[PDB]
Design a protein that fits this description.
Two copies of one chain form a homodimer.
Chain A (H helix, E strand, L loop, with lengths): L2 H4 L29 E4 L16 E2 L2 E4 L12 E7 L12 E2 L6 E3 L2 E6 L4 E7 L3 E8 L5 E6 L3 E8 L2 E9 L6 E10 L3 E7 L2 E6 L3 E9 L3 H6 L6 H16 L2 E5 L6 H10 L4 E2 L2 E2 L5 E5 L4 E4 L3 E2 L1 E2 H4 L3 H8 L1 H18 L5 E2 L12 H10 L7 H13 L12 H7 L9 H21 L3 H10 L7 E2 L4 E2 L16 E3 L7 H4 L7 H8 L2 H13 L5 E4 L5 H7 L28 H13 L15 H11 L1 E2 L7 E4 L6 E6 L4 E8 L7 E7 L2 E2 L2 E3 H6 L2 E7 L5
Parallel strand pairs in A: 27-28, 32-36
Antiparallel strand pairs in A: 1-3, 2-5, 3-4, 4-10, 6-7, 7-8, 8-9, 9-16, 10-15, 11-12, 12-13, 13-16, 14-15, 17-31, 18-22, 19-20, 20-21, 23-24, 25-26, 29-30, 30-35, 31-32, 33-34, 33-36
Bound molecules: beta-D-mannopyranose (2 copies) and calcium ion (2 copies).
The site of one beta-D-mannopyranose has 6 residues of chain A, from helix 16.
PDB class: hydrolase
Keywords: Beta sandwich, (alpha/alpha)6 barrel, glycoside hydrolase, hydrolase
Assembly: dimeric
Chain lengths: ~700, ~675
């Protein structure tokens, strides 16, 4: 059985607003596809519209939802029914299905509707899908179509529909129109509207249908149609997946279960989503939603760079460099359309944060020589974005004036500590890119500004705390207090948010020993939290509090790098134990998969890096900290060198939580430099029962 | 570890409107208690307010909800919080909790609120509960109170509150008022209202609190308070449970897992719920909701007799005869208050069905000599209580009435119950008239198709028929199941279908068919359809009452050995010792009793006939206390292999039997089944 068929897209999909096990969806699609496909369980639960445990479905939803917090857009629900019987609404047409016989694979979705006795099969392409419908008793099929957008349907010929649907983007309120073409191999006997939805009656009890969408035009949607039969489309999708999955090759698992790792590989290649199309002459084009006009060039959607810069993109840099460059070209195209580097695309700008963490991808690209052709423009785009004011109020740095004046955002701004620290990291990214381009004045100014994390450190308590305009800390402080000054965490986590200058953070805290004790205390504390900053409990609090990892809130991005900070401490062996145990206890090969929000490849990439044995602690520095690998023998394709790295784990016992030694080829290492990594053939960890350093 | 502590009240509690795994709640209570206690997960999901998988809770709900279809009434949510912080609504006060460390036992509920660092413990009494709250950091406690009813709070002294809450009953719209007394061992610093709820501030970071309710009066609520400390109340609740659970004693499980059976025992003793109280002079009193005045005598709520007559009550008759009589006295008291024998009590009449299946309990009591002192009054109540015009005129309900086939068949059974009770009281004219009427199931049989079908006023069947069609003429099933709803005259049903062979083929076809259904009668899919359709049992829809007896019908067929295989495999495949426990709605002891009977090896196919059909038992050696004879029956299963699906022979003491008569059962010491690999008959 090939790997792709063993991956279950339902991992992470059991969630509610109050508690996340991944907040993923069972996305069927090609890697980075423009549309994904998922069954819809309910439309009464807002963004939480799929439940893998409930054997009910309402149809297949063509979706663009990247998270339940962002929600969906330009989505379309397709519901096969028998022409006879049925019901008078979407809800009253819902059907039980056979969960055990359903297939939930990345490239293949199969469901059997027990009410209608219809077998539905779907396989994706980038811009569309091939779908087979079969009423097993030979009764005629009909198809319902529903959207939250205003949906219009025209019959073009005996076997072809053209759909148009319209809504608005959530934050910019730009008009957003998606066109869809559907073509069947059986005649369409009638179309009509029923209570806002469309009902298409078909001549046969069986049909194969081609579907495709476009954000360009109706004729582009037709062009985007699959040209091949179901099996051929399915094989192509399999090949598209396999091309990327096979950049990792597990030679020997040892004691480890590979199931979770495999699932993470699937999650790694879903985002960002393609948001450009190819015209008749073979050129990339995209809709500029600010003007409603077509512009040349690649473009992508569905990514919050604050999530993905820290784990996902660095991993892309190792294994899919062409894709990596294409993504950066797309983000540069966003800049060319709007004047600003984007923050959270879905499909246009949705970011409410002031921080611009795409800079972390830009700086990382620079330090690893990924996109030399774009380096100049990207730098200029960062600089523009960091200094320019937006008359429309949406983009660039907020409180720039105050930040420039004071060296920090004050309590005039919400979540001022978290955002000040994000700015300080961005400043480092600009400084590094300036330096590499030999712009000395800019490098010097931004390097100095990147030290602004110092402005908020309260040496009396030992934590980062917020200041008012006059520069005073607020008198009532608790390190367990969440929100207000800190985004989805407390001072305990937020204080360690200085990726770009860990040595300086150490000096700032009073030196290596005090820093060491800070880390230990975070690991040893109970997962206490206070709701003061919010006035209610949010899922991120609940996820930490119900877990046995102290204040290491692995459920959310701010704690991702914390275990690796022991590498800079008096106890460098503690990183391995923390990682081995987190990996074993926090992640499960089941529908209740993750410790928190997966966040578009962010958390899966965290897991994968854990398995490789090293981690890009500070994107923008060409360096990796050591953790502890998972498998006896795993190969990873270092695509930039067109060669395999063999990663070996010796004495790989489950009760050995420490690394005795690590050799890059023949050389003993405690940190790995990117250049050395790329020159290496072998990476060999030897484990031990007790610490040896 | 005692049995009671191994029972997890969450079995059956994972559900949604569209799909049931029991539709139970994690009820903490004493057996047949007046109030039960459950954590509340959400108030945005209607009746589906608890989810065992979600580590969130909004407080402890004092509930009277017997099913999500009926909903709740006279309920009260109690929410411990820290006096500092908190939030501005019930929703914004919800807290995560530690699911793994929580206890969900019948007599003991423990949850740790992680947001407030408060450990809550509750143990029930019949009329109240003892509660311990402990803020583990020594921060002061407050307590919120919420209800859908209009809720009023008065502070009686430093440590005592008197609560009053009012609503109306769902169908009759009778006024419904519950009083609650709360007493703490720490001072109440303040009470106030916030956005419709009450906030009680307490002096300490921990307290033990006594709670009790009444439907009589505020002073009766105070009288109902627990008089003892937490441990003592907990021991008493344990003893109350053990007294009933120990009527079954598993000596040797063999290959079988006992976990599900044990859970079913817990479910057996929850309903009906006590709905009467004891005055200062020791007499039973109840609120008559039709008048708003107090009346003497026991009274019970939360039971739909259409569910419970067929399995639960017959089982009660064997093991808890005093309780059995008390329940019947309560139902007679309902008749005395309203003029009608009740159908679905929650807490007053909710039944939409025309059928009066409490007659099945009355007739069964008669045939087993359970309540000789009530026999005359019960008979009179049945006759009084006994649509009607047309039924009397035509011998059936026509399509003028919804679900006419199901209801006609229910009436025919009720007529048999009256006829049997008449005969036993030597009222010959009534016995004769109702015996004849009990044959009315024949009026709807269509010999062309072989199914029961509906008729219009003129007596015609509707021309377009499908046996897979659900609703309209049939309640929550198709003609395939509904046609077999003639408990009281199986031999006649057989003759009516064309004889033993044709009947046999009917049964086989039901077992062999795909679980196809058509939504025609509803216009949408309902959970009962979904449960059948997703299961591998053909048209044997074990998820719902109409199919419960179908496997046992093979006992009357050319293939009497097939019953055992159907039961053994249903029992193994349809029930799971987990939160996703049941194939369908548990229905207040109805489905659990079905399971328990399966385990004993015999079944009360027709309540009102003093007779049990044979199935196939579960354990190597199980004892059951036949309380009427004050002795144990030892049930043995020989060659009890999991791949042996048939009964080679069954001996009641020394006598070979194929059906068991109640009288013989009560005289017996031993019941011995020997299993076989292949059929032997
Ligand atoms: O209100 C804070 C919330 O913000 C949402 O957009 C998401 O980030 C949630 O994960 C988080 O709980
Ligand atoms: O309308 C049918 C529905 O009616 C409710 O009262 C319950 O009996 C459900 O089990 C059922 O699905
Ligand atoms: Ca997150
Ligand atoms: Ca039922």
């Amino acid at each position: 059985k090939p790997l792709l068929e063993t991956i279950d897209t339902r991992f992470g999909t059991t969630n509610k607003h109050a508690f996340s096990r991944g907040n993923t969806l069972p996305y069927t699609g090609v890697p980075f596809g423009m549309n994904y496909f998922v069954p819809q369980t309910s439309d009464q639960d807002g963004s939480w519209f799929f439940d893998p445990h409930l054997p009910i479905f309402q149809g297949i939803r063509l979706t663009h939802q990247p998270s339940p917090w962002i929600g969906d857009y330009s989505w379309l629900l397709l519901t096969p029914v028998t022409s006879q019987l049925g019901g008078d609404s979407l809800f009253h047409r819902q059907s039980s299905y056979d969960i055990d016989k359903a297939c939930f694979q990345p490239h293949y979705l199969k469901l059997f509707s027990l009410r209608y006795q219809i077998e539905t099969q779907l396989t994706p392409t980038c811009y569309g899908a091939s779908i087979r419908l079969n009423q097993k008793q030979g009764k005629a099929l009909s198809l319902y179509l529903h959207a939250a957008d205003e949906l219009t349907v025209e019959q073009v010929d005996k076997r072809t529909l053209a759909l148009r649907q319209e809504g608005k983007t959530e934050t910019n309120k730009n008009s957003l129109t998606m066109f869809t073409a559907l073509q069947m191999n059986t005649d369409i006997l009638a179309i009509s509207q029923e209570a806002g939805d469309w009902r298409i009656d078909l001549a046969s009890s069986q049909t194969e249908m081609q579907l495709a969408t476009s954000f360009i035009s109706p004729s582009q949607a037709l062009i985007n149609l699959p040209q091949e039969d179901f099996d051929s489309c399915k094989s192509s999708a399999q090949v598209d997946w396999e091309n990327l999955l096979h950049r990792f090759d597990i030679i020997e698992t040892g004691e480890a279960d590979r199931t979770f790792f495999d699932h993470c590989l699937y999650r790694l290649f879903l985002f960002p989503q393609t948001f450009y199309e190819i015209n008749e002459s073979g050129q990339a084009i995209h809709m500029d939603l600010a003007t409603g006009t077509v512009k040349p060039g690649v473009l992508f959607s569905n990514n919050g760079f604050w999530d993905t810069f820290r784990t996902t993109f660095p991993l892309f840099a190792l294994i899919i460099p062409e894709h990596y460059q294409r993504f950066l070209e797309g983000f540069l195209n966003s800049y060319r359309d709007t004047g600003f580097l984007p923050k959270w695309l879905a499909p246009d700008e949705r970011g409410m944060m002031p921080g611009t963490l795409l800079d972390g991808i830009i700086a990382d690209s620079a330090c690893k020589d990924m996109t030399p052709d774009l380096e100049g423009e990207l730098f200029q785009a960062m600089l523009e974005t960091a200094s320019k004011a937006d008359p429309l109020g949406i983009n660039g740095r907020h409180g720039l004036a105050q930040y420039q004046e004071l060296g920090y955002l004050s309590t005039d701004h919400h979540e001022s500590v978290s955002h000040t620290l994000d700015y300080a990291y961005s400043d480092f990214c600009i400084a590094s890119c300036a330096k590499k381009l030999e712009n000395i004045e800019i490098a010097e100014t931004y390097k100095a500004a990147s030290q602004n994390y110092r402005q908020l450190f309260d040496a009396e308590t030992g934590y980062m705390r917020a200041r008012d305009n006059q520069g005073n800390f607020h008198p009532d402080f608790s390190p367990y207090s969440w929100g207000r000054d800190y985004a989805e965490c407390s001072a305990i986590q937020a204080t360690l948010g200085v990726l770009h200058d860990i040595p300086g953070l150490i000096q700032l805290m009073g030196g290596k020993e005090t820093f060491s004790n800070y880390l230990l205390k975070a690991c040893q504390d109970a997962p206490l939290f206070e709701t003061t900053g919010y006035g209610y409990e949010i899922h991120e609090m609940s996820e930490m509090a119900t877990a046995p990892f102290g204040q290491i809130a692995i459920s959310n991005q701010p704690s991702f790098h914390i275990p690796y900070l022991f590498r800079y401490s008096d106890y460098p062996d503690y990183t391995a134990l923390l990682i081995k145990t987190l990996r074993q206890k926090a992640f499960h090969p089941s529908w209740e998969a993750y410790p928190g929000d997966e966040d578009n490849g962010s958390l899966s990439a965290w897991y994968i890096w854990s398995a490789l044995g090293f981690y890009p602690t500070c994107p923008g520095k060409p360096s990796y900290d050591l953790g502890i690998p998972l498998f006896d023998h795993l190969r990873v394709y270092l695509a930039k060198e067109d060669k395999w790295l063999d990663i070996h784990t010796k004495q790989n016992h489950n009760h050995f939580n420490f690394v005795k030694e690590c050799r890059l080829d023949k050389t003993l290492v405690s940190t790995i430099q990117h250049q050395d990594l790329l020159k290496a053939e072998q990476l060999t960890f030897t484990l031990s029962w007790l610490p040896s350093h």
